[PDB]
């Protein structure tokens, strides 16, 4: 027989796109961020939670986007598809 089992607990995304030396890993960390941004965009579009709230949200929105610019791009620099290059002008 042989050993091979997975799916025992969720994984915590890193902080340095460089640390993740996995091409197929940066492809999943980029999509996970997109879902977060949207979920937040809604609360903001509502404009019925209160300045204090809107501020907290918008604040994260950027923090979430910045991460994407590194992932979506880090995936291309690793040898995969380009998600950041297309989005916006050329940088780097």
Curated annotation (Swiss-Prot):
GO terms for biological process: generation of catalytic spliceosome for second transesterification step; mRNA splicing, via spliceosome. The keyword DNA-binding does not apply. Belongs to the ISY1 family. It comes from the Eukaryota. It is found in: Nucleus. The lineage of its organism: Eukaryota, Metazoa, Chordata, Craniata, Vertebrata. Keywords: Acetylation, mRNA processing, mRNA splicing, Nucleus, Phosphoprotein, Spliceosome. This is Pre-mRNA-splicing factor ISY1 homolog. The keyword Cytoplasm does not apply. GO terms for cellular component: catalytic step 2 spliceosome; nucleus; U2-type catalytic step 1 spliceosome. The gene is Isy1. Its main location: nucleus.
